[PDB]
Amino acid sequence: ISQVNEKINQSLAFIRKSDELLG
Amino acid sequence: AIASGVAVSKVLHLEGEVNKIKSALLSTNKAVVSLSNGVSVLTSKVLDLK
Amino acid sequence: AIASGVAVSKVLHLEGEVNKIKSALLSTNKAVVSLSNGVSVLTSKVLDLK
Protein backbone atom coordinates (compact mmCIF):
# COMPACT_ATOMS: atom_id res chain seq x y z
CA ILE A 1 0.00 0.00 0.00
CA SER A 2 2.79 2.30 0.83
CA GLN A 3 4.09 1.39 -2.62
CA VAL A 4 0.79 2.04 -4.42
CA ASN A 5 1.05 5.52 -3.06
CA GLU A 6 4.56 5.96 -4.44
CA LYS A 7 3.15 5.16 -7.84
CA ILE A 8 0.56 7.87 -7.48
CA ASN A 9 3.24 10.13 -6.06
CA GLN A 10 5.36 9.55 -9.10
CA SER A 11 2.49 9.77 -11.60
CA LEU A 12 1.44 13.08 -10.18
CA ALA A 13 5.01 14.24 -10.44
CA PHE A 14 4.93 13.33 -14.12
CA ILE A 15 1.95 15.61 -14.83
CA ARG A 16 3.61 18.57 -13.22
CA LYS A 17 6.54 18.01 -15.57
CA SER A 18 4.10 17.79 -18.48
CA ASP A 19 2.46 20.99 -17.39
CA GLU A 20 5.83 22.61 -16.72
CA LEU A 21 6.28 22.36 -20.49
CA LEU A 22 3.04 24.21 -21.29
CA GLY A 23 4.81 26.47 -21.26
CA ALA B 1 17.25 25.62 -46.81
CA ILE B 2 15.78 29.08 -46.29
CA ALA B 3 14.42 31.90 -48.42
CA SER B 4 12.72 34.97 -46.93
CA GLY B 5 10.33 36.61 -46.10
CA VAL B 6 7.28 34.26 -45.57
CA ALA B 7 8.00 33.85 -41.79
CA VAL B 8 11.69 32.92 -41.25
CA SER B 9 11.79 33.01 -37.43
CA LYS B 10 8.14 32.10 -36.73
CA VAL B 11 8.46 28.72 -38.41
CA LEU B 12 11.32 27.80 -36.14
CA HIS B 13 9.36 28.88 -33.10
CA LEU B 14 6.50 26.49 -33.80
CA GLU B 15 9.07 23.81 -34.42
CA GLY B 16 10.11 24.49 -30.79
CA GLU B 17 6.55 24.19 -29.48
CA VAL B 18 6.43 20.80 -31.08
CA ASN B 19 9.47 19.62 -29.16
CA LYS B 20 8.12 20.84 -25.92
CA ILE B 21 4.68 19.42 -26.68
CA LYS B 22 6.32 16.21 -27.84
CA SER B 23 8.30 15.85 -24.60
CA ALA B 24 5.28 17.06 -22.64
CA LEU B 25 3.14 14.12 -23.76
CA LEU B 26 5.96 11.73 -22.93
CA SER B 27 5.84 12.69 -19.30
CA THR B 28 2.08 12.47 -19.41
CA ASN B 29 2.40 8.95 -20.81
CA LYS B 30 4.83 7.97 -18.06
CA ALA B 31 2.33 9.13 -15.42
CA VAL B 32 -0.36 7.01 -16.94
CA VAL B 33 2.09 4.14 -16.66
CA SER B 34 2.81 4.68 -12.99
CA LEU B 35 -0.82 5.18 -12.19
CA SER B 36 -1.21 1.96 -14.17
CA ASN B 37 1.32 -0.06 -12.18
CA GLY B 38 -0.19 1.35 -9.03
CA VAL B 39 -3.73 0.33 -9.94
CA SER B 40 -2.25 -3.02 -10.96
CA VAL B 41 -0.70 -3.63 -7.56
CA LEU B 42 -3.75 -2.24 -5.72
CA THR B 43 -5.98 -4.63 -7.63
CA SER B 44 -3.61 -7.45 -6.64
CA LYS B 45 -4.04 -6.45 -2.99
CA VAL B 46 -7.81 -6.07 -3.23
CA LEU B 47 -7.67 -9.73 -4.29
CA ASP B 48 -5.63 -10.94 -1.39
CA LEU B 49 -8.23 -9.31 0.81
CA LYS B 50 -10.95 -11.34 -0.88
CA ALA C 1 4.07 37.74 -39.37
CA ILE C 2 3.09 36.18 -42.77
CA ALA C 3 3.74 36.81 -46.49
CA SER C 4 1.24 35.85 -49.26
CA GLY C 5 0.17 33.96 -51.21
CA VAL C 6 3.01 31.61 -50.24
CA ALA C 7 0.77 29.68 -47.79
CA VAL C 8 -0.12 32.64 -45.61
CA SER C 9 -3.12 30.80 -44.20
CA LYS C 10 -1.60 27.31 -43.99
CA VAL C 11 1.17 28.47 -41.67
CA LEU C 12 -1.34 30.31 -39.58
CA HIS C 13 -3.63 27.30 -39.40
CA LEU C 14 -0.94 24.88 -38.15
CA GLU C 15 0.05 27.61 -35.76
CA GLY C 16 -3.55 27.18 -34.58
CA GLU C 17 -3.35 23.41 -34.48
CA VAL C 18 -0.58 23.74 -31.94
CA ASN C 19 -2.68 25.92 -29.70
CA LYS C 20 -5.46 23.38 -29.47
CA ILE C 21 -3.14 20.43 -29.03
CA LYS C 22 -1.51 22.38 -26.25
CA SER C 23 -4.80 22.98 -24.46
CA ALA C 24 -5.83 19.43 -25.36
CA LEU C 25 -2.91 17.87 -23.50
CA LEU C 26 -3.71 20.27 -20.70
CA SER C 27 -7.16 18.78 -20.26
CA THR C 28 -5.78 15.28 -20.61
CA ASN C 29 -3.39 16.08 -17.78
CA LYS C 30 -6.25 17.33 -15.65
CA ALA C 31 -7.95 13.95 -15.96
CA VAL C 32 -4.85 12.04 -14.93
CA VAL C 33 -4.73 14.19 -11.86
CA SER C 34 -8.32 13.45 -10.89
CA LEU C 35 -8.09 9.72 -11.56
CA SER C 36 -4.95 9.87 -9.45
CA ASN C 37 -6.50 11.79 -6.61
CA GLY C 38 -9.31 9.32 -6.97
CA VAL C 39 -7.15 6.20 -6.85
CA SER C 40 -5.43 7.82 -3.89
CA VAL C 41 -8.64 8.00 -1.90
CA LEU C 42 -9.68 4.53 -3.03
CA THR C 43 -6.35 3.23 -1.81
CA SER C 44 -6.91 5.02 1.50
CA LYS C 45 -10.20 3.14 1.88
CA VAL C 46 -8.83 -0.26 0.83
CA LEU C 47 -6.46 0.33 3.72
CA ASP C 48 -9.25 1.12 6.15
CA LEU C 49 -10.86 -2.15 5.10
CA LYS C 50 -7.65 -3.96 5.91
Helix (H) or strand (E) segment spanning residue B47: helix B9-49
8-state DSSP, C31: H
**Cβ contact A3:B41 at 8 Å:** yes
Backbone angles phi, psi at C3, to 5 degrees: -150, 125
Experimental approach taken: X-ray
**Shortest Cα distance from A22 to chain C (angstroms)?**
7
What's the farthest any 2 CA atoms get from each other in chain A?
34
8-state DSSP, C5: S
Query: What's the CA gap between C11 and C9, in Å, rounded?
Result: 5
Query: What's the CA gap between A12 and B24, in Å, rounded?
Result: 14
**Cβ contact C12:C2 at 8 Å:** yes
**Cβ contact C49:B49 at 8 Å:** yes
**Cβ contact B20:A23 at 8 Å:** yes
User: Angle at the Cα of A11 (from A8 to A14), degrees rounded to 5?
Assistant: 155
Residues of A in contact with B25 (CB under 8 A): 18
8-state DSSP, C12: H
Question: Using the beta-carbon criterion (under 8 Å), do A22 and C25 form an inter-chain contact?
Answer: yes
CB of C50 less than 8 A from some CB of B:
yes
What's the N-to-C CA distance of chain A in angstroms?
34
Query: What's the CA gap between C48 and C22, in Å, rounded?
Result: 40
Query: What's the CA gap between C6 and B47, in Å, rounded?
Result: 63
Sign of CA dihedral C7, C10, C14, C19: positive
8-state DSSP, A20: T
Chains A & B: contacts with CB separation below 8 Å? 54
Query: What's the CA gap between C48 and B43, in Å, rounded?
Result: 15
